[PDB]
Amino acid sequence: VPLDGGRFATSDLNDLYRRVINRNNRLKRLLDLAAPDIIVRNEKRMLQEAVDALLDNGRRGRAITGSNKRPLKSLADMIKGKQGRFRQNLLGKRVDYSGRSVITVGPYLRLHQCGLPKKMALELFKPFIYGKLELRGLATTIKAAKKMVEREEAVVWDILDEVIREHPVLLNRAPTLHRLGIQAFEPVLIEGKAIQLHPLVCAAYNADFDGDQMAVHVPLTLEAQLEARALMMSTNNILSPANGEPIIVPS
Amino acid sequence: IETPITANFREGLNVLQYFISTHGARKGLADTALKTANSGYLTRRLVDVAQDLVVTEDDCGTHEGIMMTPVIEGGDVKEPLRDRVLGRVTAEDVLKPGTADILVPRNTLLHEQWCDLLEENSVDAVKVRSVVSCDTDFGVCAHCYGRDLARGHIINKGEAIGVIAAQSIGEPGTQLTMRTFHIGGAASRAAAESSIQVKNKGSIKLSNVKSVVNSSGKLVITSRNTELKLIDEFGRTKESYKVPYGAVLAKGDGEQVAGGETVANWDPHTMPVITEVSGFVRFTDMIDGQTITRQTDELTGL
Amino acid sequence: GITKASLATESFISAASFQETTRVLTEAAVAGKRDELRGLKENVIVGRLIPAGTGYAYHQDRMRRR
Amino acid sequence: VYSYTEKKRIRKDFGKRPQVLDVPYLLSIQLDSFQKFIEQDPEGQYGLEAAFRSVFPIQSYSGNSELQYVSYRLGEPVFDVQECQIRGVTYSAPLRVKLRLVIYEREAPEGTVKDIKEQEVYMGEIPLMTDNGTFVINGTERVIVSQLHRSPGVFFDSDKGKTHSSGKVLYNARIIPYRGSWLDFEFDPKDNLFVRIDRRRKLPATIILRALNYTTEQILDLFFEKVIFEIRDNKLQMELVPERLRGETASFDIEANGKVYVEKGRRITARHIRQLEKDDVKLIEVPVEYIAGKVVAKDYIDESTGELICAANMELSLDLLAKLSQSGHKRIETLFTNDLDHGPYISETLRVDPTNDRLSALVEIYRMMRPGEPPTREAAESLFENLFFSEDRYDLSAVGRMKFNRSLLREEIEGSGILSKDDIIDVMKKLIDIRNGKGEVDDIDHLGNRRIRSVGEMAENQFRVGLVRVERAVKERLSLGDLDTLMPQDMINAKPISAAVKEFFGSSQLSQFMDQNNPLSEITHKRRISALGPGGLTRERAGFEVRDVHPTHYGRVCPIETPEGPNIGLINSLSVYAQTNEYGFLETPYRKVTDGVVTDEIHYLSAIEEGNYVIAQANSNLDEEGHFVEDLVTCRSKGESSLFSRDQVDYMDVSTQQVVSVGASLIPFLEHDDANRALMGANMQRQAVPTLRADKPLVGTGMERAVAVDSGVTAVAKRGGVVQYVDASRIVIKVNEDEMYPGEAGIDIYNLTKYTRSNQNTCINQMPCVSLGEPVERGDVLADGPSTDLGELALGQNMRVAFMPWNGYNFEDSILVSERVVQEDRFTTIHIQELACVSRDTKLGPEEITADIPNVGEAALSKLDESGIVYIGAEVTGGDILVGKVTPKVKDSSLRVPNGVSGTVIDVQVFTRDGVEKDKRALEIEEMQLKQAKKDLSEELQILEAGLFSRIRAVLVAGGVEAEKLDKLPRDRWLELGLTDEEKQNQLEQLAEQYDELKHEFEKKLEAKRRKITQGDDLAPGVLKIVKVYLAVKRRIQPGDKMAGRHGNKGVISKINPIEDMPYDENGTPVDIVLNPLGVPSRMNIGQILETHLGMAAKGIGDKINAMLKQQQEVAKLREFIQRAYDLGADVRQKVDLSTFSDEEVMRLAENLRKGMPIATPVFDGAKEAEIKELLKLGDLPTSGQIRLYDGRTGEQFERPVTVGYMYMLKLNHLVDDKMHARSTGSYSLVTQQPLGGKAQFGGQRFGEMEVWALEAYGAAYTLQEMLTVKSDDVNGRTKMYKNIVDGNHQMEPGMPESFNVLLKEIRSLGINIELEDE
RNA sequence: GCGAUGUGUG
DNA sequence: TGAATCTCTTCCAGCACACATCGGGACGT
DNA sequence: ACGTCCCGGAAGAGATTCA
Ligand SMILES: Nc1ccn([C@@H]2O[C@H](COP(=O)(O)OP(=O)(O)OP(=O)(O)O)[C@@H](O)[C@H]2O)c(=O)n1
Ligand SMILES: [Mg+2]
């Protein structure tokens, strides 16, 4: 990685490899001069300890450190831990087409729909918008479309209504616990910058409006929209899966 | 703490009372954080052992079934038979207590109508099918899982019950944790009640009693798990209590008692070592300083 | 216990994802433990359908073909 | 009587308890500590002096050359604070040290050849402390939080239960030295005493005993008491002390000196011991079958030959008895070993000893310290001598020695800094004696064992580390002697010291970034007491008793202010009155109490000393003589607290506040809130953003004055005088005469700080509050800072609130705000962002800043000037270009407004690396700054000269007032004006010399400033020029922002409402915010309701004054009404009168009340329901405090009157336009092709592990597939998906997750082989 | 556009 | 002579944000 | 400077108690 400048901040794998290669080279040099036995023995031990560090630092005694005093990260640590590839990039992945904001109430909603600010909508459904623009023919290439949606000329709002009308979006609240932590809603464009949420659903999200934040995702493919409508809609969940008693109880 | 606050927010609080309240609230916060960590780790473990489990067949075709009875703690029946066996496939047909009048066939789904029938006909034991004894390979058949929740009808073929189960178990551990504070620092403590105050006319039934008749003509209990029960005037079991060791029974077994008739009486802060024989006492293997210690009352001189 | 019944599993990508990886990988290595997909977390790691719902219908199709 | 500024708004003040100690200066910790660090203190005693006198003189190997110390000095800083913030340097001062170098003579006694003083060798830099108590490091302003760590000394801990799973407690004694190696003693479940050192492996404590050069006989004689048997004809008369006749059954019929006195079997009772004592006999007679259970004391050899009979510490038997009997050793010594008095612990440990003598002992020590290497005799000897006895590598502080000698129950509290044989032995004796039953453990939470460092002590330790490295260097270069061909500028090396002190102030868990968005935030972040960091404990090893609160905190550390979250209780905040001891402990005030009279003489007490005394409590009614009013009064003695006698107390608390902190004592009605809500109130009040028009709180707690005056944000006048000139930039005060020096006369000038940037981007600003021609007194405000109103801490603004449900728009907590608020711009806060743009010359060529940009438009360039930098004032929006920058290829790389933020550009800085040419706008700004500097210094000289000449004109009235010859000539020609032969011409000499010195200092400072502004800069290696730009965003309020009260009532403002819909009251005025009733009895903070009522009282009085002032009312009426309002209440302290207000000050007092009569309420000695009812009823408001309200929509009445009042509400810098964010397609990470994370980087969210579980729990599977294959990772997949979308065909084609492919590559790079079998 | 520490949110 | 039980060593300890600073010195041309 | 280096829980394996 290049930091700000012509300097490269330390990278732990390359460090470990560099160490092992230096030890290997020096010991290769000793084994062409009939070197003395104590020195070749000491150097074999150094190479062994270096490879042990490389494979799995720290399982031996005092782990090496590179910055000042923190053990640098070896391959077993690229895999293990709360931050190995398993629990960090193969189960929970960062996702495109997402977004987030603060929630607020708006009691004028039918319970199968949620407000969603204009700017988040126009930022999330950009590809769909491009499609509909160059389908109507208001812009030939893709770059004309990009200019138009960036300048926010007054056609994109009608375009955006038509690409929203019947298109569920998944709302989520941060510490998701039970399978009601993700639900679907149909969007309704709003002014302002806060996601509005029907009041009979804070019981499920455990969301008071004292500043909670909710994240929205967009289902892309057609099967996925049908799932967000037939399995994850807000209406389709009016009974908790733990106990039978309702979970849309007025609060 | 053994020094309770004796004032309420509408009244002031002097500084000391408020300081004690601080003890309490910092309990609240600390426990939220750390016990949150615990509960989260718990749900993780659960959903990683209960994962590879998916309803896969419409009917295994067996006959094992666990038993289901109402659960009582000593007051009102806590979780009655209707609440326990709502929505679960009956293993073996329930005979009306008019024996040989088979009331429900042996693969019905006890939905709400059947629960009302069971409640009317006053049944207190149903043998019902259960996942733990389902004979399907690699999964669980539909019926043996019983009624789905979150939907009325029976479970479908696919709905991954492993994960939903693991979450619904581990969830209210976390949700209550991160909330345990905003009751305040109050102390959810209840006394042992020191006596079993029966509530309604009925008869008595003891289970696992090994008693003995003390000098004063009473009956003390020298058995560990002794469980007392109040039966009603129709045969139904209405009450169950845990009578601790060494407690004093008023009435023996099989005697009609009525309401408000204290039957048991013990000391809630002492596990006595009551005998069963009568005679003199010698200390065996009791050497001072090594095992026992020998204190003396200045006041009584003893 | 649960935190043992999850490790002593037929698959090993599951175990590897759960709570330690050194032990599971070394053991699975020395035994050559071939792992099928057969479950949910394995199929998610590898990134395909999940034999849970809609995915369950798909896996009917797939196991039928093979 | 009052300070003339106070007579501008004299706050009504409830509160019954008369105070006696004013609030101390709230930054004593930081300021005194650094001032103590950096100051020429003689006689050593905690300074740079101390570090130097402890490390110097550095002597070679007696190489007839030695480096010694003289004195030190600090230059002036090169850059004053403001320039330093602008540029990025450390506000530092050089360190010039006088080091002498003596050169002795070879072939001679210790005589010198020639000594030399390379005067003021330079070394390092040390960052000075700004007056506020904050350090500047790199253009930012950083703060060092004091640390609360365990006191160097000895502690006898228990560690009960857990270990050994048998309930057998252990007892480990630790010696914790302030600098060096630990030392630990601990038992085993085998009652063996084992030592360890630096928590390494374990050793037998007797090994260190006789590594101190003892012998086993000596050891036993030190630890155990002897027992004497005397060989005689009849049964070896034993010496029997009655003390050894307790608890057991003697093994014989006890007679001696005649008749039987204590018969066998009769367990010896106390009366039996009394019999024995009255018997006057200790020479008694014993059986022989008893000694079999004893151990011999010292060695017994055979006196006929000279060989060992039995060695010391060996048990006995009849054969050995006879063998040592043949030689006739008539007296034999053994060890009295009761299992209840004196366990043979040293005995057993000696038996377990695997060692022999000093040699083998030191061998073992070495072998267990530095493992696996030859145990050379000299090596082990030097090692052990240099672990606990060398002045270099081991040292207890003087505090160490104090706490040590105190805990050992020694006598004096001074001594050497190293341990000693006797000290280790006393530690061991105390440990064993604890094991027996006398003595107690020392709990650690007890504030008699923690200790507060601060900047002084920590910076001194780091500087000492720097010095040990420089001594290595100096000694190394000096031992290679060279006669005189060098001097002490090359033998030294400033670089290690500089690097060390830089490292400390920059990179640490303590020296951190100051939350500088709110005067309260500054002043409660400086007074913080962290328990983390180096030397202290860590959150993962953090126990739990330490997170609990402890009874010694009462009045030393705030109970109800701790940061909730990952580290609770470790980050205590300090109390209000608390101080640092002389040694470092936290002491607190009290009031001395003689017999029954509470003297007003204060008296500071530490932690431990608080225990011995009985202390009364501050809310005890005492009657006008220092006498208590009861005869039994609540008090606290040692942890406990109950009702004691009248004539037994010894100290009464000072004031009812001293239990809380500054952060918590600004909450009214605290004693009505749950502690959790008090805590959340403290935090939210710390997070409140300043506003555009500051406004006092109607209902405060009087601590605003101290906080706002001592927070520094305001400009407290120093010498009381008369205001001569006010102006939104500066304020120029004439000084009263009797408050001035003979010379140096002049006048005072305060340069206010106009709109500039804080660390949280809020706009720090100042405004003159005093108008021209107005007295000011010493210690008084002139400039409102950010969120200060007439010198009161006004964070938020007070709004008319009414508790009621209202069409759900406040369902959970969602405050509902009427449009009246947003119209009157009473939350329109100001931010100021800082945008940078660097220019670098790299391979392929440099990067220009020309206005010409490839593929842009004249509209997109108009706001740029002829160089490429925007004007000052160009109201840019999101997307525009601020600085046109291109890269060689040529590619657009300009700087642009971050998307979403509007606002005005207010300032542009340009830095050019020395050597590169300056462009035309850089020259423009150069000359602008030059002319500003010239005009400012010229104003200095001109106004100051005006003052001086005015004073001279005042002088020459007596002594030759010559009006003509005085105004004839230019006033500067006053060398020889007609004045008698007196001292007044000498005084004119004084003033004229001051004038000439002003001349020359103006000249020299102007020249230096021109040099500063002319010169180039020093910048990052690899940069050419930097262009900094500031914006001024004006963020309104809008549905989404977070407002909060002061009691945990948070809430996201949900719907803005038109003025009509607000529930207007019975008179017309529409309530301005609707809260939610259901929030109170759940969130048990009943405090805010009383705050509301009392505010409504205050504003009722305010409107009554407003009417009496609009209808002009013959100020007698105002006087009557104001007087009644100030005299209302029960027995209170205020007692103001309005017959001493000159009948015009009263008009101004009403002018400043017409917004509403403010009210105080000190924290716990506050108002009561009765007093609020009485005040409301003084107003024309209903007693209940509830009014009928009418609905704005339907116009028909509400049922059941509702609560209205004025609650003081706050904004919070958690704004919706800084939280909202959205990503459709942006960058991608580099190693695992996934989208980045965060908002700055245009990242998407984290569909996390539990969300994957939620989707698995549903039946959804296609959603999850596209959620972690296409939307995220697989590259072929998502390009094909993007195209399928832009064609209208919604369909996915999965492929495989790239990060999974990476997992394969790693598992494969290990030895393992993971593959993918064929289908 | 990497990782550390830190403060602060739900 | 072998099976308990005491000692030491590895492995884990909730989720999602937001923002800030800061990234290695030591010697021949 | 440029260039080129230096804490509960549990399971293994002592080791100590039965003979
Ligand atoms: N370590 C934490 C802290 C907080 N939360 C989230 O914060 C919520 C609690 O919010 P909080 O405001 O702290 O308490 P509430 O009772 O919900 O609201 P209030 O504090 O105003 O009473 C929890 O449900 C949880 O979702 C969390 O998940 N993990
Ligand atoms: Mg909350």
Ligand SMILES: [Zn+2]
């Ligand atoms: Zn089955």
